[PDB]
Design a protein around this ligand. Structure first.
Ligand SMILES: NC(=O)c1ccc[n+]([C@@H]2O[C@H](COP(=O)([O-])OP(=O)(O)OC[C@H]3O[C@@H](n4cnc5c(N)ncnc54)[C@H](OP(=O)(O)O)[C@@H]3O)[C@@H](O)[C@H]2O)c1
Ligand SMILES: NC(=O)c1ccc[n+]([C@@H]2O[C@H](COP(=O)([O-])OP(=O)(O)OC[C@H]3O[C@@H](n4cnc5c(N)ncnc54)[C@H](OP(=O)(O)O)[C@@H]3O)[C@@H](O)[C@H]2O)c1
Ligand SMILES: NC(=O)c1ccc[n+]([C@@H]2O[C@H](COP(=O)([O-])OP(=O)(O)OC[C@H]3O[C@@H](n4cnc5c(N)ncnc54)[C@H](OP(=O)(O)O)[C@@H]3O)[C@@H](O)[C@H]2O)c1
Ligand SMILES: NC(=O)c1ccc[n+]([C@@H]2O[C@H](COP(=O)([O-])OP(=O)(O)OC[C@H]3O[C@@H](n4cnc5c(N)ncnc54)[C@H](OP(=O)(O)O)[C@@H]3O)[C@@H](O)[C@H]2O)c1
Lengths: 257, 257, 257, 257
């Protein structure tokens, strides 16, 4: 296969959960920029409609609908709309939307626990199950979860958040092996500190980011499109021999002494 | 500190969940053999009473009560009995009891998901929270989760089971870092195929174990006391500089090509 | 930067060691396909000349000279020619050329040891040293080592080969952290079994292929351009936040139980 | 086997390279404390003689001879003496003695490279080869390398040192798999900062200590016997199912964000 084909996504369809802000927003534009048809979602109808209007002016083909992926019913309705819009053919699934709690281990409540598990673990797992017939039908499927580099080290207050992301890391390996017979590859991008609306409060704390950036060899927090780039590459045919891998996008955070 | 003291557990107290069968049963006898006072539990009153009667004849000091660690209420009652029996001083917590489901990813039900998470992840997490005041009060605390070597590789049908065990692996690192100030170390033993009542059906399938043992460099399945030995060592003062680690007890399974 | 600029190597200069066959040949053509001026080498003058002739006819700007990277003097002369050709401005360094010995541990000779160390480890380390001033001068530097997925698992007869590759994996982390101040990133691509002239004896052993393929979830040996694609991506500005990582390109080999 | 027999080295024979100071000295006394007949070595005749005199007075059966493990001829003469002393029956091989250089990557000289490779990598590999017939003859063999926790992260000035130790980590996996048929297990203990005569310049730099201690969850540098304890455990029959593992002994250093 030629270079132009191997580095292209024209004629592919993709689903990105939580694509109205930050990393997921960058992933949607990065996928559409390489010729993919993108479907996304969020919980805010006004914000989602503004983004769909913005992407239309950029000549992108992006559809979407309101969906809280922490609800089993709404995950099923979402995959039913995706299956009808894309005619049951889905090439790409990006499990981007997540949830975050920053509390010491003693302070994690029962509701904190179930919230993180529902949005970070059960949602991705169920969406993979629902996507399986469509990924197999497309002929070339690519699942990319976005996890966190703190699923390999210990950060203060990240216990249950990092634990759910660690489960996602292992789920990557099971999916890659079980669904290899369906020509479906599964990988994970694990970001470090990235400038998103969710990381804004931490970013506006001068003393907090100074502690963080000092641990980063590249000496800065990452940008959303620095995560979206590798995410998109893993979905290209050029990555046809890469499956089951956890790629850290952290500027060297986790490997730094 | 002398060699005899560093390799001893005399004068310590321990809690082992699910200590009536298999690995947990071996852990209880291994802890008691080194002079520890052991508290354990299971869901079967008759079987638990027989084990407590057996350990009494072996001159062990083992107490216990019926408890389903998948229930939040029963976990709280258990830690209240442990706190009264041990006078609020607990040195060792062994999160041994677990749950297992063997199904392809497509077949994992919503009830399969919540069952595995409750017994493998939430129970261990909550029991650590409840044990924290007593571990800090003892002056030298040791938490050991028992996970699985399949939280680092992909085995058929192990998806959600391995995913919960992967979360346990990351939780080890958070606990070791957050509670280091309380002189509490946290580690994890990750067993391979071990001869227990739970692994019996797989063990009695000649073709299935032949596939498994062929992947094991040592050419056999492990015994329960091969897991209990390292578990006990991690609780001794000799392991005083080992914390946050995931030790695989698999006969070389996961590192074998 | 825009999408077009982030996914481009236009205006860059690169060095690939061993680009006349196999993976290195795929990397050269992949780099030039994205607009990079390439310099390559090998030990065979006639073969390198034919490659340079072929690449010029494909309108690539690729230069080359004969060099045995296992020779310190020839590594210095190589980096001297690269400096004059590119005017002391080098963006990319790909350490591809290596050596291989398949013998049990009892059979590895002292000459086998020193050969594997010289070609797989010392060459890459020294070339990084000699390239450091030029990479810093470019303003945007990217080092990529080609290691092996068997640096994480044990394959029969791979002991010393995998040991040197394991040393490469660690060197990646040191290079990423020490030279991040110079705007240089360092990563590593660790391939599985790839169809190259070196692997030809392994590929023509139908029994040995079937044994290896059975352990690969994707059910096949990789192709050279499947390694070259991710190699080139790690050199693009799109990978600006990825450093110190070892990316296994093996079709799921190392994570398949 | 019973508890007493599984946690015993009575009747065993061991070899520790570099047992006159620091970690190796702790390993010798720890092995003999459990009943093992030990053989050790160093490059200083007077110091080794005093150690042998001290160990005899403590009623240990420890023998020794002068040997520079960086010399192939002296490694062969060493293993020749070990064979006659133990009558060709060797249970345990501890590769403790090593070398260290702290320089930035730009400053590592060709002599620094070859020195680190010879003492940290080639010595251990060759000694394993020479010990293989004796370990197989013992009927129960155990190899333990002493690597470093910095073979998983990047510390300033550790590049080549950590690279050789990273090679040791991989060699552990090959040795465990190739020699499992001979009833030989191979594992690795990877220490953090330990109070040894070698680390004395680092320990007497109050600024350098505080910088390192701040990254250690346990908030202190380790002690030699904290490394020796787990080293001895991996040689006991109790560890019969543990092989091919790298156990970090660093107080949580490598997993602390
Ligand atoms: N520093 C970092 O940013 C960082 C570091 C490590 C890992 N990560 C991971 O990277 C991923 C991206 O995170 P982010 O930083 O972009 O912030 P985020 O809050 O995880 O992403 C927010 C986007 O997802 C949507 N969303 C949130 N919860 C949702 C739900 N339950 N159902 C449907 N949509 C939902 C949001 O829209 P609405 O709020 O309107 O629903 C918004 O469009 C996350 O999974 C996170 O765990 C981020
Ligand atoms: N091959 C293997 O055996 C293997 C491999 C990898 C990992 N592991 C892990 O090693 C650990 C030990 O497992 P195992 O093989 O000994 O079998 P297991 O079924 O996990 O352990 C059973 C013991 O725990 C008790 N138990 C089970 N569920 C419980 C609950 N909800 N509440 C309280 N007690 C409970 C059982 O008593 P009752 O049933 O009477 O309650 C029994 O005493 C598990 O966590 C498992 O995940 C085992
Ligand atoms: N299955 C696989 O192919 C596989 C698997 C894992 C890792 N790898 C790694 O991936 C890399 C690519 O290997 P490959 O299979 O492409 O090898 P290959 O097909 O034999 O290619 C070797 C290339 O490097 C050149 N070369 C070899 N030794 C050299 C030296 N001392 N100095 C200068 N040039 C030299 C060769 O040219 P001359 O021979 O004319 O000098 C040739 O152009 C290697 O580092 C290998 O260790 C490969
Ligand atoms: N902070 C740490 O201490 C630390 C951290 C990470 C890893 N490590 C590793 O742990 C191991 C223990 O190091 P250590 O700190 O105990 O070193 P040390 O205190 O300097 O002990 C060195 C011992 O080995 C002997 N020795 C050194 N070079 C030798 C050679 N070429 N041939 C024969 N014997 C030799 C020495 O005796 P002579 O000098 O009289 O020959 C001495 O008995 C080393 O492999 C080291 O790389 C240590």
């Amino acid at each position: 296969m030629s270079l132009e084909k191997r580095w292209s996504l024209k004629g592919t369809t993709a689903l990105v959960t939580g694509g109205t802000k930050g990393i997921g927003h960058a992933i949607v534009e990065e996928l559409a920029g390489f010729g993919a048809r993108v479907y996304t979602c969020s919980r805010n109808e006004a914000e989602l409609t503004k983004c769909l209007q913005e992407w239309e002016n950029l000549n992108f083909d992006v559809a979407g609908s309101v969906c809280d992926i922490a609800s089993r019913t709404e995950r099923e309705e979402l995959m039913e709309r995706v299956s009808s819009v894309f005619n049951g053919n889905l090439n790409i699934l990006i499990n981007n939307a997540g949830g975050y709690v920053n509390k010491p281990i003693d302070d994690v409540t029962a509701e904190d626990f179930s919230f993180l598990v529902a949005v970070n673990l059960e949602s991705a797992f169920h969406l993979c199950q629902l996507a399986h017939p469509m990924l197999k039908a497309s002929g070339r499927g690519s699942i990319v979860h976005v996890s966190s580099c703190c699923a390999q080290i210990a950060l203060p207050g990240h216990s249950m958040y990092s634990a759910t992301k660690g489960a996602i890391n292992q789920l990557t390996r099971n999916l890659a092996c079980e669904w290899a017979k369906d020509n479906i590859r599964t990988n994970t991008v694990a970001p470090g500190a990235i400038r998103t609306p969710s990381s804004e409060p931490f970013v506006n704390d001068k003393d907090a980011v100074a502690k963080e950036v000092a641990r980063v060899p590249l000496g800065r927090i990452g940008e959303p499109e620095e995560v979206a780039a590798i995410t998109v590459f893993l979905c290209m045919p050029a990555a046809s021999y890469i499956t089951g891998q956890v790629i850290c996008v952290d500027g060297g955070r986790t490997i730094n002494g």
